[PDB]
Amino acid sequence: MLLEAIAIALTAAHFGAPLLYYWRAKRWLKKPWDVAPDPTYRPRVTVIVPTYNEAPLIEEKLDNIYEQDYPRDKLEVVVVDSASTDGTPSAVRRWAETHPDLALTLVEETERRGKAHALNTALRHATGEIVVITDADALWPARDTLANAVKWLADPTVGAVSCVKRPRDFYNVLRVAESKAWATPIFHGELAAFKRELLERLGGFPTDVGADDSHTATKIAMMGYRAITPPDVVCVEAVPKRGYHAWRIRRAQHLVQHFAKAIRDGKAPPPFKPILHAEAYLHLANPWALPTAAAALAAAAAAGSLPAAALLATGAALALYKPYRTWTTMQAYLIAAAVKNLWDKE
Template sequence: ASTDGTPELVKKWIEKHADLNLKLIVENERKGKAFALNNALRHATGEIVIMTDVDSLWPSNALSKTLKWFADQTTGAVSCLKKPIGPKVKEVEENYRHYYNVLRVAESKAFSTPIFHGELAAFRRNLLEKIGGFPTDIGADDSHTATQIALMGYRAIIPEDLWVEEIVPNENYFWWRIRRAQHLIQHFARTLRGIRQAPMKFRKILAIESFLHLANPFLLLVATILLIVSTLITYSLTALSILALGAILLTIKQYRIWTIQQLYLIVASLRNLWSKEIVWSKQVK
């Protein structure tokens, strides 16, 4: 269902590489990424299914670094760390991604991470089929699929030496971040029911990430509102001092980045009330 000439480019590339076993699957209607992935899954025959995004750039050894982890039969899924690139990469994206990557590696070393990256995500095909393929009613198909595999007792990991570059949008960066936040919120809201059944090592990780994405942003919002009301109505010096301290802390990069992420999550949570953004328009990168 592509209208930007992508199928034609793929056909030309296939013609130039006749020695490779390549198949182009064309859909008549855009129903979202997960529908396309499930369609492709029906044609897949290998033991490992690997997905990517058009805006990602792999190093030449990405596949070998990915596949080696599947030698361990307890590994069910593998993803990558991301490095943002592009002419308009913002400081907030670079710093956010740095801390985000550290968390993903730490969670992986503990057992599994509940957040995967579609720029490079690999899954055992038999496990994908066992869980019914990719979810089509929420946006985070990569993360939710990996989490479902981890809930079965397999590891879903991001190695610390597997890097992929991701092109950041030149325009509408804010809404790009909101859409991604929406999808993660949908994922964690859906996963709440499975926390108690999660493997012990994964349960704590899943509970913390769910809290950070679903509850923490609104605790910050409520606390800020209460402090402002207390300052204006009761003239509380304590409330005023806390607000002043918070304003001063915004000069510290780490705190400022964290605060911005909370704002993204709040806006994304509200936007999920009327639109899940399962299908979205192509962005200029």
């Protein structure tokens, strides 16, 4: 009956860890920000939209950037497209001449070499103090979204700002709590704002990691700057429609590469090290504890004891309730990401 022991031990560990971490997040959450947004801070801003074959959405994406209240003499746009088959370059060119007061630079590249490479080239042609990366399928809900993020970058210790997303609460809590404590290791591509000096020390975006926003936020936090996601900087998450599950596992893959590579570079500031280690644990270790328990009880069930069959029937019965479904499928995504990662490289 020792596989029931190991099963309920592993289940207690797997579900115990995130809830203790959530409780420590909620005590950080009730401590006030040690940095302040400044509404008169007005630096030069470069918004970069990297695009590969997104001719449908990029006209309306440009219209969405165009409609920000942010003052236009301090705003410029670089649409970086590295050899798209669709007519995206002269779609942006067409729009570019329909909206002339908005400074636009379409830089085009020999050859597609991935998102980070495109971003790196766009960086050298950018003139702003703040660089905002945003995905072409991302739309900013308000006309002061951009200004809200910028207001949060005024403090010299804040190196990077990203948004809180809406369409779980637990996920958001971890974000803003880690932000208040020091930094959050997960940023969002819907809006990722960096100080150009910092990108330029790092320097630029490196090709090796999938989650460029989160990896850059994490290395800026490693340097002693704040990487934060304030609750009033909110974007809408762009859900893909096709291949929802493949899309979510590929995001999980980016997160697992990022956390695996991040923990292997020691020396985190004392405020960050518990955040970094907890998030890396939840992303690299805890998922495995789940299906190991499930297999322990499956073997215990098919042969022998079958209180284990009651435990798996209760597991399915708890798939009734939708937060359990969300959590278990996120763990599933993470496990698939780990194996897809290991066999992807060869």
